[PDB]
Ligand binder design. Structure first.
Ligand SMILES: O=C(O)c1c(O)cc(-c2ccc(Cl)cc2)cc1NS(=O)(=O)c1ccc(-c2ccccc2)cc1
Ligand SMILES: [Cl-]
Lengths: 233, 237
């Protein structure tokens, strides 16, 4: 019986989590930091212990993981950062609010995007204020032309998340290490989907809470032995 | 030059405030030590430094210094490797005692010997020591061979267990082109500085590295310093 914990970062700055933050490396707001502190406290109260930590390369996630580790006094744990856990890449929508998206592209198209699993938003073009910021960012310089996305469908995000899960995270769990994952809504979606074998429509319907420990209890083949349980009051 | 290496030594801890012996006790920074790290990182920033990998102990005063630096420079994404081999020197049974308690229990002679010596360890930390479970039983050294877990350390011991990590794990990455940043402790950094500079036991013991100040090394292809360490920061500091 293995124990796996997910945490999803809370609010980022400038209201960006309602502006398709995506691959833009927004920091937490003071609120989102607070949220992460609460998740840490929860974990501390419950006496949890971990042996390895996995996170994305985006600082809203990393800073949540740091807050948690501090709260529970395991700042000495090994930490592995992978872009494969990055937030979904929203391409040209990244930065816009709901109204600006509708203005730019129309409510029919937005609805189609909001409802599709396989259909990407329009790519981030050079005239986008985040194009160089993200695509020429030092931290992705090792990614081949095909790996570095200009935009992703939920299918795409999950596709590039799972290979890291399988190849890195699964081995450690099998070796009995107690994993903690701090990441973002859509990458955690992909993990959960492969876990609970959910349908496309089902996963699009799932919306994981922020800054809250999500506890999974697993059997010897990594299937959950019961539904996901949360942590707090 | 070919390569660039940067070290940083963490600053004031909670127990420095109490002037207790920390060693492998996992004390946090004081507010002032944290602020120090913020200044170290603001310096690194102003200079424009970039890194590819970072190294540090498994003691939170190093780790938090590292974190603070990475925040100030906007490289929180970097890979980070933690190792006990970078830990502060283990002070054995002196752990938790302050200057007064050390002197009262051991006398001027003994403490002077321990201070001015390179390979005389302090007393072992025995199982009845108030911090023995706290440290020796801490689950973070579980993968340690019985011969690796010190009860106490000379400065020699400390360097002896530090240098294996340097040689085997940091050197490769430097020669790979990876700009390294090391966040650790006075004595482990002493070991690294000693190797880099070929210093005598005398000179190394006389050397006292500043806290929270980036220490830069410019290195040729053989990891030989090409000039004396530099301190980063505004003119005064
Ligand atoms: O320079 C000094 O360190 C010193 C000294 O040489 C002599 C006296 C002294 C005067 C009067 C009386 Cl009655 C008793 C002792 C006090 C001193 N300072 S100390 O803070 O206590 C201290 C002593 C030893 C270590 C030490 C331990 C283990 C490994 C390495 C270093 C660290 C701090
Ligand atoms: Cl880290």
């Amino acid at each position: 019986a293995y124990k796996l914990v997910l945490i999803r970062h809370g609010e980022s700055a400038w209201n960006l989590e309602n502006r398709f933050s995506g691959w833009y490396d927004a920091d937490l707001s003071p609120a989102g930091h607070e949220e992460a502190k609460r998740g840490g406290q929860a974990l501390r109260d419950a006496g949890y212990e971990f042996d390895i930590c996995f996170t994305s390369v985006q600082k809203r996630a990393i800073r949540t993981l740091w807050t948690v580790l501090d709260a529970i006094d395991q700042m000495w744990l090994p930490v592995v950062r992978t872009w494969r856990l990055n937030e979904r890449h929203y391409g040209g929508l990244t930065g816009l609010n709901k109204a600006e998206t509708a203005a730019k592209h129309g409510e029919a198209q937005v609805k189609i995007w909001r409802r599709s699993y396989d259909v990407p938003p329009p790519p981030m073009e050079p005239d986008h204020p985040f194009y160089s910021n993200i695509s020429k960012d030092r931290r992705y310089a090792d990614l081949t032309e095909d790996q570095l996305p200009s935009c992703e469908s939920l299918k795409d995000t999950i596709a590039r998340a799972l290979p890291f899960w399988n190849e890195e995270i699964v081995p450690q769990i099998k070796e009995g290490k107690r994993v903690l994952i701090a990441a973002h809504g859509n990458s955690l979606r992909g993990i959960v989907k492969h876990l609970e074998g959910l349908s496309e429509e089902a996963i699009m319907e799932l919306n994981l809470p922020t800054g809250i420990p999500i506890v999974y209890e697993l059997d010897k083949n990594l299937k959950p032995i019961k539904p996901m349980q949360f942590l707090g009051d």
